[PDB]
Write a protein that binds this DNA or RNA. Structure first.
Length: 49
DNA sequence: CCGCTGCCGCGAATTCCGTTTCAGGGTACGCCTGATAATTTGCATTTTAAATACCATTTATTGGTTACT
């Protein structure tokens, strides 16, 4: 709290990180590593636009 | 105070054939670091123009002359 910021501002980053890291590790039968998941997500975001 | 309702379970033929093996989620980014998977040399075993060291039984040259168109 010494930083003087609202709690939610800090907490949201950790929550997003945890959720996304898990959805990368689990959720596939054959486990693609994290970095490849990031690259595939970039690929898909570029393809739509 | 031993009757009836209402829930929930469970089941519904046989072979072949055909066919599109097929798609859909809507969320970030940049560091250190060890952790494998690549790539680089030497040493065991073949295989060595062949070269080599002995046994082998079977023709070859043979030892030519004594009879004689």
């Amino acid at each position: 709290y010494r930083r003087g910021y609202k709690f939610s501002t800090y907490a949201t980053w950790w929550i997003r990180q945890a959720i996304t890291r898990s959805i990368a590790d689990q959720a596939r039968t054959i486990r693609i590593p994290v970095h490849m998941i990031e690259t595939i997500n970039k690929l898909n975001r570029i393809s739509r636009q």
